[PDB]
Amino acid sequence: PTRFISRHNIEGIFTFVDHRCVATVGYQPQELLGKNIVEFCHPEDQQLLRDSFQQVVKLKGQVLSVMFRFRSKNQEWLWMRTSSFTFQNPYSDEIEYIICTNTNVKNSS
Amino acid sequence: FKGLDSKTFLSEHSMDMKFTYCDDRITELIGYHPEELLGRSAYEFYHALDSENMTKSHQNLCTKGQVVSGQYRMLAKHGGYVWLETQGTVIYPQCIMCVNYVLSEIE
């Protein structure tokens, strides 16, 4: 399974991207950092993705998964399954951020 | 004194605890280069006195889908150990995603 990790703020902006993104979606980390994940999302799926990011912060660190179409560096729609959860260092009251594992999956059955 | 972000590193593991990814913050904290951890079991790096506790934490992680490890010691590259706590989450099982935060200087 081709996958990479990302960290996002609550709004969806990439604040960290693991280098395995190149093999997964074709972009360098530098091409994703500072951008919102929704900017790469198929228009039909953008609201689902926003709504998923909004909810995951309310689920007390449980995983929320979402499937969406991600525009690869070749301008092609790849099915991604993003499993997300929030983290906040328990020694602090820093705002939660979101940790994602992003995997190219099949849409088939 | 280190900021919060600077004492945390992310790692990914297969279900047997072998590293499949580690972020570079670990170098500044514990000495390892991520590439040298890959394929090694995290168990190789736990202090002997924490091994049974970490086995229990791994069992709880696999049965519940998430765990907070409680405090344990990880062996540092150049000797000694650092105290850590880890929040683990199973990604579905496909892999384990760990948020590791350092609780002490090297001892």
Ligand SMILES: O=[N+]([O-])c1c(Nc2cccc(F)c2)ccc2nonc12
């Ligand atoms: O499955 N795991 O890989 C796992 C941990 N891995 C780990 C991650 C970073 C450093 C370290 F010494 C060990 C650390 C604490 C854990 N508690 O349950 N599983 C754990």
